[PDB]
Amino acid sequence: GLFEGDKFVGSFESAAMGTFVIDMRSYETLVNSTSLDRIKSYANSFNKYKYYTGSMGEADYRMACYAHLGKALMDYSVSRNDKLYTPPTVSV
Amino acid sequence: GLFEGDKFVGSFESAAMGTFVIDMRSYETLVNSTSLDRIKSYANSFNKYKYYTGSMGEADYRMACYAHLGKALMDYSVSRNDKLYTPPTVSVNSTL
Numbered sequence A: 001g002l003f004e005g006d007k008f009v010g011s012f013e014s015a016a017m018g019t020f021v022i023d024m025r026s027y028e029t030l031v032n033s034t035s036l037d038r039i040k041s042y043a044n045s046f047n048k049y050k051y052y053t054g055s056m057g058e059a060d061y062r063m064a065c066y067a068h069l070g071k072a073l074m075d076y077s078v079s080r081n082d083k084l085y086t087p088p089t090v091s092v
Numbered sequence B: 001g002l003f004e005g006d007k008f009v010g011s012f013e014s015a016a017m018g019t020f021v022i023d024m025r026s027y028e029t030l031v032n033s034t035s036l037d038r039i040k041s042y043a044n045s046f047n048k049y050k051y052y053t054g055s056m057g058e059a060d061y062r063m064a065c066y067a068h069l070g071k072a073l074m075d076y077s078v079s080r081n082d083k084l085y086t087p088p089t090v091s092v093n094s095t096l
Helices: A012-017 A024-031 A036-044 A060-078 B012-017 B024-031 B036-044 B058-078
Strands: A020-022 A053-055 A083-085 A089-091 B020-022 B083-085 B089-093
Touching: A012 A024, A012 A036, A012 A060, A020 A024, A020 A060, A024 A036, A024 A060, A036 A060, A060 A083, A060 B058, B012 B024, B012 B036, B012 B058, B020 B024, B020 B058, B024 B036, B024 B058, B036 B058, B058 B083
Parallel strands: none
Antiparallel strands: A020 A083, A053 B089, A089 B089, B020 B083
């Protein structure tokens, strides 16, 4: 689960695939358990996955998600706007 | 990654996600390590996984892969035409 009671508790990995609001408290939680360096890296691969088109091998589904959560967190850090996170659409 | 040297060596699972040519040698390999019964089953879930309801979790994709490789193998068994296998095509889109 992403929550335990009323506060966000997910890892970056679970989170990346779930639905939750990025606010100062969830952000605080993630950054402090991942932290900022991995997140930045994940964020980097965002263009690589913003419109990822083609076959995924293993592996890639996960990275897509990690990449999107990554960017979302980086955007939040820049402009402190609470915003809802949901995983990207992966369709055939 | 599906290859000792020059010959195919992948499991059904790795293979299902990778790129390789289905020919009599890779077919022989897979059938003899999976075998024909699981493959047939996987093959059966194919139509489901052709016109899927968009996304389609992690999960779902893995299966679509197994299903996809499954059918390819069954087709090859029927008509022995060497054919390239690649995992199924996807689109990834954001969601605000």
